[PDB]
Amino acid sequence: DMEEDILEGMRSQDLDDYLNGPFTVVVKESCDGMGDVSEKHGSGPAVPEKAVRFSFTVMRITIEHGSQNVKVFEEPKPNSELCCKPLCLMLADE
C-alpha cells in the first residue's frame, strides 16, 4: 500500500528507481485495551463489554547498497492514530 512512498524514498536518497532487495522492515508491535464499547441506548446499564485489539505499525524501512545501510522510509508521526493498522479485534476482557 506504501508503494510510491518507498520509490520516492529511494529517489530522494538518489539510488536507482529499480533495485532488488533486501530491505529490512522494522515493525512496531502493540496490543492494548479499548475500554468500553457498549451501545446500550438507555433502559438500564445492560453490561460492560470491554474489547481489545492487536495492531502493528510499519515504523521504518532500510536498505543497503553493498556496504552502507540507508534509510529509504521513516514514518513521521509514529504514535499517531492514522498509522496504527489493526490486525486482530476481539470483544474480550483484557
Binding site: 438500564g44 446499564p45 445492560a46 453490561v47
Partner: protein
C-alpha cells in the same frame, strides 16, 4: 437427592469450569484456579471448607521439597490408595498448552489445622502417551502388584497437520489402552481390536480387576455411543495381558460426575444427553463380583434456574456429595457470574 444452595466468600472468581476436588481424610481441597498463581496464594491449591453452607477458600502451603505445579484445567485424576495420594496427569495449562507430566500429590504434615502437601512429579518412559485432556486414569491391583490404566481422550493436531488458520483445532486421540507403572515410569501401549473410535469425557469405575468405561463423547462422528465396556485385565509375573468385552445397556452420557455412595456402589449425576440440550435424570450403578447393573434413581428436584440454564459443571467432594455450578444470567445484569449448589446423596 437433597439439593442445597451454598454461598461463596470473597475469592469467588478462582472457580472456573474444570477444577479438581482432592480428598484427604474426609477433608477437601481445591485445584485448578484461574489465571496464574497469585501473590496471595503462591501454590494454587486451597482449602475448600464448607460450614453452614457458606464456603471459604483458605490457602494451603506446600512442602520443603515439592514441585510447584501449573493449574491444570481438565486433567485426569484418580484416587490411588497404595498411604493415600492422588495422581494428576496431562491437563491444559493457562496458555492453552497441554502438559505431559504425571503429578503425584500427598500430604507431608497436617497439624494445627494447617496442612502441607508434598507434590512431586514423575516422568513416563516406554510408550509415552501424547498430551491430552478429557481423558481418565485408573489404577488396578493384581497378584499383589499394582498397575495403572489410561484410556484416550482428545488433543490437538500433531506438529505436521497444524496450520495457523486452524491452530486451535482438536482431534480425538488414538483409542489404545496404556498400562503405566507408578514405581518406575514404564508405559506399554496395547491396541485393542474391540475398540473402534476415540472417546472423550467418559466415566470410569474400577473394582480391583476391571475398568467400566461407560459413556463418553465421540468427536469425529459427533454422537454419544451407548456402549458400556469392561476392561478385565490380568498381571502375571512375566508379560501383562489385557482384555475387553462389549456389553449391552449403556447410556448416552458425557461429562457426567461419578461418586461413591456406599461400599462398591456409585451414582451418576447429569452430564449431557445431546449436544444442544441437557441431561436431567440421574443414574445408579451397583457393582458385583462379575456383574454390572445400571439403574435410574428418583430424579432430584431442581431449581428453576437449573431447569432454564444451558450448561453446568462440577466435581465430587468424596463423601457422597457432588459440588456443581451454574453460570448466572447476564440478562438480569446483577450476578456474580456463577451461582452454586451442593448435592448430598447420603
Amino acid at each position: 437427592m437433597s439439593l442445597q444452595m451454598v454461598t461463596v466468600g470473597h475469592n469467588i472468581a478462582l472457580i472456573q469450569p474444570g477444577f479438581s476436588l482432592m480428598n484427604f481424610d474426609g477433608q477437601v481441597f481445591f485445584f485448578g484456579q484461574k489465571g496464574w498463581p497469585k501473590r496471595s496464594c503462591p501454590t494454587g491449591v486451597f482449602h475448600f471448607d464448607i460450614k453452614q453452607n457458606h464456603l471459604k477458600l483458605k490457602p494451603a502451603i506446600f512442602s520443603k521439597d515439592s514441585c510447584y505445579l501449573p493449574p491444570l484445567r481438565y486433567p485426569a485424576t484418580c484416587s490411588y490408595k497404595g498411604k493415600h495420594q492422588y495422581i494428576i496427569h496431562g491437563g491444559k495449562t493457562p496458555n492453552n498448552e497441554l502438559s505431559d507430566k504425571i503429578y503425584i500429590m500427598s500430604v507431608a504434615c497436617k497439624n494445627n489445622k494447617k496442612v502441607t502437601f508434598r507434590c512431586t512429579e514423575k516422568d513416563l518412559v516406554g510408550d509415552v502417551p501424547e498430551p491430552r485432556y478429557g481423558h481418565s486414569i485408573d489404577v488396578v491391583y493384581s497378584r499383589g502388584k499394582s498397575m495403572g490404566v489410561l484410556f484416550g481422550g482428545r488433543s490437538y493436531m500433531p506438529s505436521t497437520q497444524r496450520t495457523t488458520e486452524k491452530w486451535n483445532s482438536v482431534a480425538d486421540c488414538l483409542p489404545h489402552v496404556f498400562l503405566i507403572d507408578f514405581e518406575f515410569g514404564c508405559a506399554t501401549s496395547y491396541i485393542l481390536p474391540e475398540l473402534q473410535d476415540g472417546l472423550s469425557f467418559h466415566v470410569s469405575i474400577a473394582r480391583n480387576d476391571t475398568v467400566y468405561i461407560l459413556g463418553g463423547h465421540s468427536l469425529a462422528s459427533n454422537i454419544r455411543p451407548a456402549n458400556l465396556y469392561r476392561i478385565r485385565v490380568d498381571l502375571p509375573l512375566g508379560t501383562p495381558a489385557v482384555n475387553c468385552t462389549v456389553l449391552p445397556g449403556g447410556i448416552s452420557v458425557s461429562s457426567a460426575i461419578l461418586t461413591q455412595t456406599n461400599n462398591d456402589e456409585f451414582v451418576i449425576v447429569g452430564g449431557y444427553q445431546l449436544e444442544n440440550q441437557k441431561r436431567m435424570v440421574c443414574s445408579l450403578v451397583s457393582l458385583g463380583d462379575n456383574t454390572i447393573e445400571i439403574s435410574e434413581m428418583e430424579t432430584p428436584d431442581w431449581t428453576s434456574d437449573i431447569k432454564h440454564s444451558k450448561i453446568w459443571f462440577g466435581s465430587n467432594m468424596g463423601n457422597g456429595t457432588i459440588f456443581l455450578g451454574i453460570p448466572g444470567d447476564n440478562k438480569q445484569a446483577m450476578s456474580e457470574a456463577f451461582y452454586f449448589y451442593t448435592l448430598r446423596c447420603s
